[PDB]
Amino acid sequence: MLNDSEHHLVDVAFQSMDTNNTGMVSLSEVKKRFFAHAHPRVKEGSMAPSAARDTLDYHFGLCAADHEGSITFDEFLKYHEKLADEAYDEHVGDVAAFTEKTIMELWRLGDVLLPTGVRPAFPVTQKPAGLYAVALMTLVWVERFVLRGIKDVVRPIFARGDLPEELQGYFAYPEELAGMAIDYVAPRLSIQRWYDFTWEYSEGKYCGVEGIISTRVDLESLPAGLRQFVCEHVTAVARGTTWMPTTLTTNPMYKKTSSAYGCGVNEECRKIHHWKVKTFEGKQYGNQYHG
Amino acid sequence: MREAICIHIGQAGCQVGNACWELFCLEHGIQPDGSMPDDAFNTFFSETGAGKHVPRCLFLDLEPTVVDEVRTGTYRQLFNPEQLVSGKEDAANNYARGHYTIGKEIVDLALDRIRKLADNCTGLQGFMVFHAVGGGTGSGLGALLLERLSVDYGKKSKLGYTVYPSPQVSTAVVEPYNCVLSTHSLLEHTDVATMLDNEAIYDLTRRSLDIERPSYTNVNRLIGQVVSSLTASLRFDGALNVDLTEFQTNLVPYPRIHFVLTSYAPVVSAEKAYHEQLSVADITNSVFEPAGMLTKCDPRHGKYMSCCLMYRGDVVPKDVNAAIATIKTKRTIQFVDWCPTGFKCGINYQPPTVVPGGDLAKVQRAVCMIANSTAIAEVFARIDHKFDLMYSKRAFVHWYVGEGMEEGEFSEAREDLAALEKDYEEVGAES
Amino acid sequence: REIVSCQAGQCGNQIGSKFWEVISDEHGVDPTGTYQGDSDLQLERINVYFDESSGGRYVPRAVLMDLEPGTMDSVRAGPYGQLFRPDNFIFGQSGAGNNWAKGHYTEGAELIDSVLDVCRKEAESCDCLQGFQLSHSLGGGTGSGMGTLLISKLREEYPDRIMMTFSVIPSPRVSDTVVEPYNTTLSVHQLVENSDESMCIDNEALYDICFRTLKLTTPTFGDLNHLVAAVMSGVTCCLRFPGQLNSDLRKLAVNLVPFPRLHFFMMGFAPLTSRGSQQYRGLSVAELTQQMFDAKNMMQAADPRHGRYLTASALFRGRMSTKEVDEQMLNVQNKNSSYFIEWIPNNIKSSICDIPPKGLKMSVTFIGNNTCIQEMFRRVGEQFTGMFRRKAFLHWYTGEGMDEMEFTEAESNMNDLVSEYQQYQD
Amino acid sequence: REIVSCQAGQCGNQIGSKFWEVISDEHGVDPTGTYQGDSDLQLERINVYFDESSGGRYVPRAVLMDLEPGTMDSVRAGPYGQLFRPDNFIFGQSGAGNNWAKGHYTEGAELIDSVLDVCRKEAESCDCLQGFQLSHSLGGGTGSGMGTLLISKLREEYPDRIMMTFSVIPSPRVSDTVVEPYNTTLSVHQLVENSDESMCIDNEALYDICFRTLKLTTPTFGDLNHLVAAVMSGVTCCLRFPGQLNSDLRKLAVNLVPFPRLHFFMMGFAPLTSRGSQQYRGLSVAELTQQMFDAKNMMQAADPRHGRYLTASALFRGRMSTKEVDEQMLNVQNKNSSYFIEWIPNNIKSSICDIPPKGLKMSVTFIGNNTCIQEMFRRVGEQFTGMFRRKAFLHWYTGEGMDEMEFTEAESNMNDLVSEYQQYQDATV
Amino acid sequence: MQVADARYEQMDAAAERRRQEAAEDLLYAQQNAEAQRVATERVQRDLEE
Ligand SMILES: Nc1nc2c(ncn2[C@@H]2O[C@H](COP(=O)(O)OP(=O)(O)OP(=O)(O)O)[C@@H](O)[C@H]2O)c(=O)[nH]1
Ligand SMILES: Nc1nc2c(ncn2[C@@H]2O[C@H](COP(=O)(O)OP(=O)(O)O)[C@@H](O)[C@H]2O)c(=O)[nH]1
Ligand SMILES: Nc1nc2c(ncn2[C@@H]2O[C@H](COP(=O)(O)OP(=O)(O)O)[C@@H](O)[C@H]2O)c(=O)[nH]1
């Protein structure tokens, strides 16, 4: 039996899915919005997303036949009660929380990035760490609707929470793109330079991040919705946009053991030079540099 | 004046010299760029009118990865494009090839660079070669370069820091072959040789520095520290300044008895450092105990023959004398009968400087020991037995004989090492 | 420095295809040959496998060799098939017929002129060639005959260079050819004289790894080729990347072959972990050693417990403290001295490279000159003796320029090799 | 002081599953494997039972064993089943068939090699192994037949490590399988030879505790397994937590094994009280001693009054004064001297741990080397004689490789152990 | 006393090194999870096929 949170989630799913507010939802739309890769069995690896679609067929076929190829919120709620009942048998500690998570993941509900629809692997506000701070993401967009992207062109040097809510979805990890039909664009060979990402928040004043988009991205292949935000560093400097402070994360997979030899040398050398001079004028008492 | 030319042969020589040069730059206040942000650096850094200080070293490896690592790293602006020689193909764990075939094609330019460095220097005290006798290019090219240096520069002092194969850990199987074959060069054309095996330093790091996962970086840093403690007398002021020839004479009693063991105190981490009062007596006892030994050679098993102490910091000669008298009184270690004094000590006011990124704790006083001891016979009496097992069944000898070396050279090197063991046992014999 | 790769037969073609895929993934090279690497360390040693053109395009120093031109179109359809040069594609018009004699005396001899033309071109392009790297199968016709004939001529032309060969030994369980022992014996007697390091892979053990270690449900040959490619990259990782204590193709050999005849090695890779046990495993040098020396992890159908290790080499990759690798190898020897020869001390060499393979904290490739490798030779020799006592299937070879007693010389060579292996085993 | 736990059969797998649940609860470990404990002491000594992975996954050092894959499926499907390493699940296609021969010689022998490989993997990776802790039921086939193979081989491999075996000894009243005499006789002589401590459990005594002490109405196998899991945690409480008087498995063996063959012990856990009477009881050291020495609290069914105590071990948990915990044992000895052996002064060894079980402010486990342990051996030996004299049910054993000779040797060894216990029961100074 | 004062900043540098290594360990755990995900995706793909 669904309690308040799952009831709210299933109602939101049904409402967002029925754009006409008629309480009558098409099975083809059920297949379109069914994120079958979110099935717990599919995530485990013993089920196919197509098999999830066909078990959805099994669950809804007779009701669709009764209601002329359409589904009512009452039967949707009955389906979700059956899902919640099945969720008890599954082995997680928190059955209820597993239920909200499964419902949201299946029906594409929750903190979903507006432009493309990618759900963040980790919360947007927190700065990236680990693979989320080292591995490059895929620059994605929506074209009339198909999602199309370019691999490994965005550095993870910035927090996605600082972006406008209408621009976050263009940036997404392969973790997030997993399970989504993503067309791909071959990048264009070019030297290793990085385009910025700037947007306008007031007349004459702009904000953005510096050097996150690789120059391998083809501007012509980019849609007009992203060409206005992607720009060259010289253009951004002349435009005088505000820079959000990003963090440069060094790749450790290529950290030579000998690279650790020379860390702190500059600061220690400055301190020892100060010690040397202070001894030379003679203000130094105690530990004295002897030459 | 007072220059000392450094040589870094083979991979191990390259990393050891890397650590040594980083520590020297930190000691003298030189940036990795080469400019400082008192002519106390001329002994390691060649002064130039541009404000830079080119190091007085020769990196030399027959394979290019380590020298290219140096050419890529933080010391690009410090290290000269030359004095950083790269080969084309490594000797690859083959003494015969490293000393015979691909060694002659590079020793000429190596000697050219050496002559350039010597001409740049004016009062060169001596050469300081760093290598591991286990490695192919290391052992072979070090042997050949030391032959050339001995036949060219005459009786100039040559101090070698050799990473001998350890009793149990060894990264090569023909390493006993390379060790026994390079022993002949290390005995005749090397003025002093110093054991720097890896097990002892690993154990010292895991005991004192409290490093559960020690690597070559810590070992190289300890080697740099002991080398700096050796050269601090000629780099900085001190109560009893000692030169290369000074401790040379006071350390080598016979032309063949020059292989020496080293130890350092106080080796300790920062967290455990302030809980202990690092007095002169305490550091001397820590040195004389086998725990602080940088070699897998227990001095209790033999008799001390000559000891050299490099004192650094606020050590006072009275405390030095009290500590050495206490060591004489102590029974757990005994000296050879014919050398009653047996102690050389050189005091310096300069305290050691800890390299950031390392693990040594800063200390107000430190001491290094370089010792000729009769117990040194055990490392060689272990390596020859290590070698004989392979040599009996003629394993791996075809690689060495196919690179221009006679099979009798193995027997000649074994006989030389046997004589070395014999006279190590003979010098300690009671009168 | 530079290593030039040749790969013969359809088996060798696929092995080298996935090898070039994994090398290009490690070096940040797309199928179009451009550089997309994120680190400078991916370019300093790009000349080992890729040669730069006038326009900056990196083309592999690789030669594709097959009598069947059908697999060339499959390589074209392959994801990275556009990476190679067109002229390095020496393919015959008539099929090999699964015949070592056809690959070695009739068609192999007539195509190996152009093969050596291409090989000399690549060698002269190389600044200082380190050696040749040939991948082939000893059960097929063109993989076994032409590959060994190429080994012979390349050894004749280049004495000092290293002929590292990756031969696919057939298995009784994975027996997919009736002339398998004919081909295997006719190839091994060429290998013993013309190869410095002839390190073999076996399909039965590849299946064992994919079923129990990685626990694949329906593993195609792609998984096997990925395994052999990922363990093939480990011999040259130390050349392509800086190492705390590295080696190369014959710094490994000088420590791995105590005698010239004994130069056949058995392979192993770590860490290989399954989907279920991916998260339960704590990556460490100890866990890598737990899997290198596991007999049921090795890439051969010859259990190392039945023999004693003559020599071994552990090519570790990744930032790892040297004390643990040294301690692990030393105490493995100490606790398992019954499986290590007493007259060569510290049978295991350990080398360390800083950069691990993409997607792993630390990995390691294992080279083993174990005496138990002679079990496969016994199996092949027994199958031949059974087939030759009645002189069957040899007419296809004899009518293609093979004298009968050449093969008997080959069998005597195997008997000598097995005699040496057993002599040092007991 | 790591301990490796091995688990055999359906009974062993379920008892160890509930034990690992209890240990994870005590040390603050989620089913997902993360540490959500609220104290430092949990993490201080968590290496005793759990090995840490790269991502903070604390995997138990448990080797799970059964010739039937159904029990392994159940253990994985359990709420804490995801904690166990997937490669530690070693199982066969065909079950033991409740046959000790099939478990020890035919099917368990073809699978024992991988089990020993996993045991070596776990044991030698530890810094310093305390020992092994096997859990099984002697009545069953794969729990007893192959569990004994575990003991035999781990003895040859690790002579000096502690060996601790929890055998659920079958009882005539709750005998739910018929070949219990054969299996128990064939397993007891193997246990007595090469186990440091064989610490017995009885299902009927567990049922008695559940029905009367805990006042449960319909107790299940989980309710039965909770008590034995509690004593399983209590024995190593001193290992895992600091205390005013520390102890370990070797201390228990030394103070409870006067002679090598007398290492079969009594179990007792306190406090045990029904939720109805839980708040009616003044819970202190005196009541702990009362319940610990009470016969009904023992979860092996053999009255201590019929015999005499060789030795006793009082493993107390809780932050309490030590004068009372010592004086209680002293007073017990001083008055019930008729139930304690005269020639060991102070038969009771007591140790104190500072951390009581979660949800309890102090508790105690009892380990009793008593002379009444042989009553169960005799009552199953009579059944063994009855079945063996008529050659009944021996074709299933002899068709798998055994013979009458080994059955007779097992009988003789078991009777020798019984006589050794009886001689010290009626021994005089 | 000055040596102790410098030892204090030595300890702070050591703590910085330790937390950097902890971040590295977190990254390696995430990489292990990434390999898990890649294997799972391959299984999903051939299940679709
Ligand atoms: N102290 C110290 N010893 C090292 C270091 N690196 C390698 N070694 C020693 O060197 C031995 C391996 O041979 P290497 O010295 O590296 O080889 P090489 O001198 O370059 O000669 P080749 O093998 O021909 O390249 C090991 O057994 C180590 O004992 C290091 O960084 N510090
Ligand atoms: N590991 C691996 N083995 C293969 C592959 N392709 C074929 N084989 C093995 O090679 C044998 C057949 O060799 P074949 O391809 O006909 O060699 P060819 O006749 O010289 O082209 C079979 O028994 C297979 O087991 C592959 O892609 N990977
Ligand atoms: N305490 C306890 N005893 C059990 C449990 N499961 C089975 N048993 C006992 O074990 C006996 C049968 O053992 P069995 O399962 O056949 O052993 P196996 O063949 O090795 O799995 C029965 O008499 C039960 O009383 C359990 O979960 N807890």
Ligand SMILES: [Mg+2]
């Ligand atoms: Mg080298």
